[PDB]
Design a binder for these strands. Structure first.
Length: 48
DNA sequence: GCCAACGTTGGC
DNA sequence: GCCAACGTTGGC
């Protein structure tokens, strides 16, 4: 994508409820493994 | 207070 | 209706 080196993205499928079958993505910072739950939040972190 | 789970919201 | 960013919230 436009992500830097060592950034991992993970799909998690919603298993239950009305939204079941929906996918949420999560972003992992390379050498810290810190977790962000959107693209707006990650590029903000990288921009500041 | 953190956060995983699932809900809500509005531009498309 | 889809998408996905973001609201909420109860169990830890």
């Amino acid at each position: 994508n436009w992500l830097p080196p060592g950034w991992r993205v993970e799909d998690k499928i919603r298993t239950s409820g009305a939204t079941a079958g929906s996918v949420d993505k999560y972003y992992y910072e390379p050498n810290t493994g810190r977790k962000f739950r959107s693209r707006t939040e990650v590029l903000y972190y990288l921009e500041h």
